[PDB]
Amino acid sequence: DCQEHDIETTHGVVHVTIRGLPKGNRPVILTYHDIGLNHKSCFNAFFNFEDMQEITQHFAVCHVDAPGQQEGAPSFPTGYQYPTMDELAEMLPPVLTHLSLKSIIGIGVGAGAYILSRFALNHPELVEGLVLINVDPCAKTNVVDIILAHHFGQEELQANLDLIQTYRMHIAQDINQDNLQLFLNSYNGRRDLEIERPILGQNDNKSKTLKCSTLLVVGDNSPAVEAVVECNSRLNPINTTLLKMADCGGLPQVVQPGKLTEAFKYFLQGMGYIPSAS
Amino acid sequence: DCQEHDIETTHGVVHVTIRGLPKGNRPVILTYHDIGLNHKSCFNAFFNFEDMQEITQHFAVCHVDAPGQQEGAPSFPTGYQYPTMDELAEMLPPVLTHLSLKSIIGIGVGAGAYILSRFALNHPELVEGLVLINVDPCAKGWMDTNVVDIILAHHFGQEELQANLDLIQTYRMHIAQDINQDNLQLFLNSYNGRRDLEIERPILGQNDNKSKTLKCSTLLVVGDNSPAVEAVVECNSRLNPINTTLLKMADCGGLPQVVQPGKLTEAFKYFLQGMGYIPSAS
Known part of the structure; x- marks a missing residue:
């Protein structure tokens, strides 16, 4: 399995991490996590949710842990040349090639969102759709207090509820504090996606955009609300949808997995997959 | 997952290789594999069987790969002190500890079987039951070309082996390619140098000079045409018939988990049923 x-x-x-088994005329669900998380902390709560297993049985689910971000990863040397965000997306075709994967349905959060997007623009042939959670297509004391600051809204982060401290502990312990610095640094070094919405009549600026179907996701109480909204305005609305999730901030995948599973289903039905939908 | x-x-x-997540009370099914195999070569065919997924989903399955037998393991150095079978069995307690596992239900093949049994004698509190496939409790006595040819003989019966069926060739290629040929020899060396299990069937009249025997439920499994049959049968004779059962699988030789898996899954169910797990049959 x-x-x-x-x-x-x-x-x-x-x-x-390959879970399930795919067919040759059916794609794979490639996953890519955000800074401070891995495939386990980021997605498994959402992915092991009851409503998802009905989906996931049909499609094999592959979870990519970023370099040095996989659990039990050894410390990267001090002067290691850590792959840049752009380079990371350069590493994704080999992953598909290695496992004879013909195409994917991407699911990414924040940095994972960006990296899946870059990849989708670099190789739109290999990408069929994108779920882009808390994506930011522009550029930008304690590293742990910095990542929780990116992840959750001040009200929510200040409130330090069970979620806040739970994931505060993950970041701290699960993920290499050397390799996590280099992955944060990389994300922080990200360039503008430079994608502009197309015009049907004629394009005022010759800027490439995502050819594949896109579901943008962001919590109302997310700090990434403006950035996901910018992105939407810069994407082809014929292929794009914007979901603003109520009562939700950081990690909407874990905060509201019920609401997000339903959307992923509706999204997947739209492409032609899970037509029966139980 | x-x-x-x-x-x-x-x-x-x-x-x-842990699959699923176990609670405190229910024990986590532990595998240990034979020489020239790994957890993949040995168990995944059997474990990924239809009827098993019904049982295995309910229990966690920690697949142990032997030192330098896991796929893509680097060659050990020339003079590397490779763990003796007893030392191999001492590696198990730290694994339960590392994964906060309370106890296990062991499944072992050949060396796998012996290693789990040494563990079970060391730590009866940790083992709830054992399924032992093609086990040999007695010392080899063959201290001395190609480990692969050696290993094939070990796993498959001469009559079976003389035919050269798809399994003999399939597993002949697996032993060659799957395993680092440096580290295999050492694991083969380590297994061959094994000592007598020092088990002796108790007697009900009076204590048999404080005889030492397994305290957990046991199912010994061997193919009719296996070359291990009289070793397993000896083992059985040396064990408590109250807490033991011997399964002779008809029209089957070496690697019964791979051959006739449906039958072994059914046997393995009844085994689990005896412990009080799986109250209703799937």
Whole structure:
């Protein structure tokens, strides 16, 4: 059923986790986490949710842990040349090639969102759709207090509820505090996606945009509300949908997995997959 | 769902592969494999069987890979002190500890079987039951070309082996390619040098000079055409018939988990049923 691979790229190694088994005329669900998380902390709560298993049975689910961000990853040396956000997306075709994966339905959060997008623009042939959670297509004391600051809204983060401290502990303990610095640094070094909404008559600016179907997701109480909204205005509305989730801030995948599973289903039905929908 | 771990022991690292998540009370099914195999080669065919998924979903399955037997394991150095079978069995307690596992239900093949049994004698509090496939409790007595040819003989009966069926060739290629040929020899060496299990059937009249025997429920499994049959039968004779059962699988030889898995799943169900697990049959 499952298998974990350590795949050799030209930008070093990337640790993946295949769950389920795919068919040759059916795609794979590739996942990519945000800064401070891994495939387990980021997605597994959402992915092991009851409503998802009905979906996931039909499509094999592959979870990509970023370089040094996989659990039990050794510390990267001090002067290691950590792959840049753009380079990370350069490492994604090999992952598909290694596992003879013809195409994916991407699911990414924040940095994972950006990296899946870059990849989708670089290789739109290999990407069929994108769920882009809390995506920011523009550029930007304690590293842990910085990532929780990116993840959750001040009210929510200040309130330090069970979620806040739970994931505060994950970041702290689960993820390499050396490799996490280099992955944060990388994300922080990200350039503008430089995607503009197309015009039917004629384009005022010759800017490429996502050809594949896109579901943008952001909590009302998310700090990424403006950034996901910018992105939407810069994306082809014929292929894009914007979901603003109520009573939700950081990690809407875990905060509201019920609401998000329903949308992913509606989204997937739209492409032609899970037509029966139980 | 699944997770791999490279677990530090005092006898070095041991590779393991956890699928599902277990609670405190219910025990986590533990596998240990034979020489020239790994958890993948040995168990995943059997474990991924239809009828098993019904049982295995309900229990967690920690697949242990032997030192330097896990896929993509680097060659050990020339003079590397490779853990003895007893030392291999001492690596198990730290694994339960590392994964906050309370107890296990062991499944072992060949070396796998012996290692779990040494563990079960060391720590009866940790084992609730054992299924032992093609186990040999007695010392080899063959101290001395190609480990692969050696290993094939070990796993498959001469009559079976003479035919050269798809399984003999399939597993002949697996032993060659799957395993680092440096580390295999050492694991083969380590298994061959094994000592007598020192089990003796008790007598009900009076204590049999404080005889030492397994205290957990046991199911010994062997194919009719297996070369291990009289070793397993000896083992059985040396064990408590009250807490033991011997399963002779008809029209079957080496690797019964791979061959006739439906039958073994059914047997393995009844085994689990005896413990008080799986109240209703699937």
